[PDB]
Amino acid sequence: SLIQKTLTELNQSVTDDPIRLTIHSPNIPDLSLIDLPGYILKRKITELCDKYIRGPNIILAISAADTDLANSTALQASRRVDP
Amino acid sequence: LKRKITELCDKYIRGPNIILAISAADTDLANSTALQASRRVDP
Amino acid sequence: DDNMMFITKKMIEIRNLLQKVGQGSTVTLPSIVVIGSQSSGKSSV
C-alpha cells in the first residue's frame, strides 16, 4: 500500500526518465523487467514503445483472450520490430 | 494490408456521414479502434 | 539450482551499473520490456 501511494504519486506528478525499483521476497525469482505505457498523444506513446522495443531487448508481449490475435497491438508491434 | 483497410475506412468516415461505432464490452473503450477512430475524425 | 538464478543476478546488478554510469553511457545489457494493448494492458499490469 505504501509503495502504491508512492509510485502513484509519481504517476500523477509525471523528462521521460524511468523510475527504478528493487523488491526482495523469498518466493520471487530475481528478474529484470521494465514496464512502459501500453498501447491505447497516442502517437507519442507508440514512439517510446518502438524505441524501447527496437534495441535487442527480450520483449514480453501479452494478449487478452477476447481479442483477435491479429488485432492486438502488443503482438503486432513485436512483429513489426521482430519479424 | 491492414493499413489499406484503414485507408478506405478513414476515407469514409472523414466526410460528414452519421457514423455508427460499435464496441464490445470486454475491450477497454480507449483501445477499441472503432471508438478511437470515431473520436479521431469527430472530436 | 542455486548457481542458475545467480548468473542472472550477477548480470542484473551489472545492467544496473551500465545504466547508471553517466551521460555517455549509451551502452547497456538487455532486459525484458513489457508491452500490451488496453485490454491486453490491463491484463499485463
Coordinates of C-alpha atoms in Angstrom, one line a residue:
Chain A
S1 CA 0.0 0.0 0.0
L2 CA 2.8 2.5 0.8
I3 CA 4.5 1.5 -2.4
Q4 CA 1.2 2.2 -4.1
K5 CA 0.8 5.7 -2.6
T6 CA 4.4 6.5 -3.6
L7 CA 4.7 5.3 -7.2
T8 CA 1.2 6.6 -8.0
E9 CA 2.0 10.0 -6.7
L10 CA 5.0 9.9 -9.2
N11 CA 2.4 8.6 -11.8
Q12 CA 0.3 11.8 -11.2
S13 CA 3.3 14.1 -10.9
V14 CA 4.7 12.8 -14.2
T15 CA 11.9 14.1 -18.7
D16 CA 10.8 10.6 -19.8
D17 CA 13.2 9.1 -17.1
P18 CA 12.3 5.6 -15.9
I19 CA 11.9 5.2 -12.2
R20 CA 13.9 2.3 -10.7
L21 CA 12.6 -0.3 -8.2
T22 CA 14.2 -3.2 -6.2
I23 CA 11.9 -5.7 -4.4
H24 CA 13.1 -8.6 -2.2
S25 CA 10.9 -11.7 -1.5
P26 CA 11.9 -15.4 -0.9
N27 CA 9.1 -16.5 -3.2
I28 CA 10.1 -14.3 -6.1
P29 CA 13.0 -15.2 -8.6
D30 CA 15.3 -12.3 -9.5
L31 CA 14.4 -10.8 -12.7
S32 CA 14.7 -7.6 -14.6
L33 CA 11.6 -6.4 -16.3
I34 CA 10.6 -2.8 -17.3
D35 CA 7.1 -1.7 -17.8
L36 CA 6.4 1.1 -20.3
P37 CA 2.9 2.5 -21.1
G38 CA 0.7 0.1 -23.1
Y39 CA -0.9 0.9 -26.4
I40 CA -4.3 2.6 -26.4
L41 CA -0.6 11.7 -27.7
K42 CA -1.0 8.1 -28.6
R43 CA 1.5 8.7 -31.5
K44 CA 3.9 9.8 -28.7
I45 CA 3.3 6.8 -26.5
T46 CA 3.8 4.5 -29.5
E47 CA 7.0 6.3 -30.3
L48 CA 8.5 5.4 -26.9
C49 CA 7.5 1.9 -27.2
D50 CA 9.2 1.5 -30.5
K51 CA 12.4 3.0 -29.4
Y52 CA 12.5 0.6 -26.4
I53 CA 11.5 -2.4 -28.3
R54 CA 13.9 -1.8 -31.1
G55 CA 17.1 -2.4 -29.3
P56 CA 17.8 -6.2 -28.7
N57 CA 15.8 -6.5 -25.5
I58 CA 13.8 -9.6 -24.7
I59 CA 10.3 -8.3 -25.3
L60 CA 7.3 -9.7 -23.3
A61 CA 4.0 -9.4 -25.2
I62 CA 0.7 -10.1 -23.6
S63 CA -2.7 -10.6 -25.3
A64 CA -6.2 -10.8 -23.8
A65 CA -8.1 -13.9 -25.0
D66 CA -11.1 -11.9 -26.2
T67 CA -9.1 -10.0 -28.8
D68 CA -8.3 -11.4 -32.2
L69 CA -4.7 -12.2 -32.2
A70 CA -4.0 -10.2 -35.4
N71 CA -5.8 -7.2 -33.9
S72 CA -3.7 -6.8 -30.8
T73 CA -1.0 -4.2 -30.9
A74 CA 1.3 -5.9 -28.4
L75 CA 1.9 -8.9 -30.6
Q76 CA 1.7 -6.8 -33.7
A77 CA 4.5 -4.3 -32.8
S78 CA 6.6 -7.2 -31.6
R79 CA 6.1 -8.5 -35.2
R80 CA 6.9 -5.0 -36.5
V81 CA 10.3 -4.9 -34.7
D82 CA 10.9 -8.7 -34.7
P83 CA 9.7 -10.5 -37.9
Chain B
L1 CA -2.7 -4.9 -45.8
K2 CA -4.2 -3.8 -42.6
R3 CA -3.4 -0.2 -43.5
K4 CA -5.2 -0.5 -46.9
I5 CA -8.4 -1.3 -44.9
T6 CA -7.8 1.6 -42.5
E7 CA -7.2 4.0 -45.6
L8 CA -10.5 3.2 -47.1
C9 CA -12.3 3.3 -43.7
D10 CA -10.8 6.7 -42.9
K11 CA -11.8 8.0 -46.2
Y12 CA -15.3 7.0 -45.4
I13 CA -15.7 8.5 -42.0
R14 CA -13.9 11.8 -42.6
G15 CA -16.7 13.2 -44.7
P16 CA -19.9 14.1 -42.8
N17 CA -21.7 10.7 -42.6
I18 CA -23.6 9.8 -39.4
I19 CA -21.0 7.3 -38.1
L20 CA -22.3 4.2 -36.1
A21 CA -19.5 2.9 -33.8
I22 CA -19.9 -0.4 -32.1
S23 CA -17.8 -1.6 -29.2
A24 CA -17.6 -5.0 -27.5
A25 CA -18.0 -4.7 -23.7
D26 CA -14.8 -6.7 -22.9
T27 CA -12.3 -4.4 -24.6
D28 CA -11.4 -1.2 -22.8
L29 CA -13.1 1.8 -24.5
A30 CA -9.8 3.7 -25.2
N31 CA -8.4 0.6 -27.1
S32 CA -11.4 0.0 -29.4
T33 CA -10.3 1.2 -32.9
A34 CA -13.9 1.9 -33.7
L35 CA -14.4 4.5 -31.0
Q36 CA -10.8 5.6 -31.3
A37 CA -11.2 6.4 -35.0
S38 CA -14.8 7.9 -34.3
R39 CA -13.1 10.4 -32.0
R40 CA -10.2 10.8 -34.4
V41 CA -12.4 12.2 -37.3
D42 CA -15.1 13.6 -34.8
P43 CA -13.7 15.3 -31.8
Chain C
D1 CA 19.8 -24.9 -8.8
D2 CA 21.3 -22.1 -7.0
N3 CA 24.2 -21.4 -9.5
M4 CA 21.4 -20.9 -12.0
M5 CA 19.5 -18.0 -10.5
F6 CA 22.9 -16.3 -9.7
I7 CA 24.5 -15.8 -13.1
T8 CA 21.4 -13.8 -13.6
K9 CA 21.7 -11.8 -10.6
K10 CA 25.3 -11.0 -11.2
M11 CA 24.2 -9.9 -14.6
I12 CA 21.3 -7.8 -13.4
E13 CA 23.4 -5.8 -11.0
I14 CA 25.8 -5.2 -13.9
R15 CA 23.0 -3.9 -16.1
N16 CA 22.2 -1.6 -13.3
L17 CA 25.7 -0.2 -13.3
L18 CA 26.0 0.4 -17.0
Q19 CA 22.7 2.1 -16.6
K20 CA 24.0 4.4 -14.1
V21 CA 27.5 5.1 -15.4
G22 CA 27.0 8.6 -16.8
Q23 CA 25.6 10.6 -19.7
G24 CA 27.5 8.8 -22.5
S25 CA 26.6 5.5 -21.1
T26 CA 24.6 4.9 -24.1
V27 CA 25.7 1.3 -23.6
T28 CA 23.8 -1.4 -21.7
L29 CA 22.5 -5.0 -21.1
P30 CA 19.1 -6.1 -22.2
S31 CA 16.2 -6.9 -20.2
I32 CA 12.5 -7.7 -20.5
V33 CA 10.2 -5.0 -21.9
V34 CA 6.5 -5.5 -21.4
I35 CA 4.0 -4.2 -24.0
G36 CA 0.2 -4.8 -24.1
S37 CA -3.0 -3.4 -25.7
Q38 CA -5.5 -1.7 -23.5
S39 CA -7.5 -5.0 -22.7
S40 CA -4.1 -6.5 -23.0
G41 CA -2.5 -3.7 -20.9
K42 CA -4.8 -4.2 -18.0
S43 CA -4.0 -7.9 -18.4
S44 CA -0.3 -7.2 -18.4
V45 CA -0.3 -5.0 -15.4

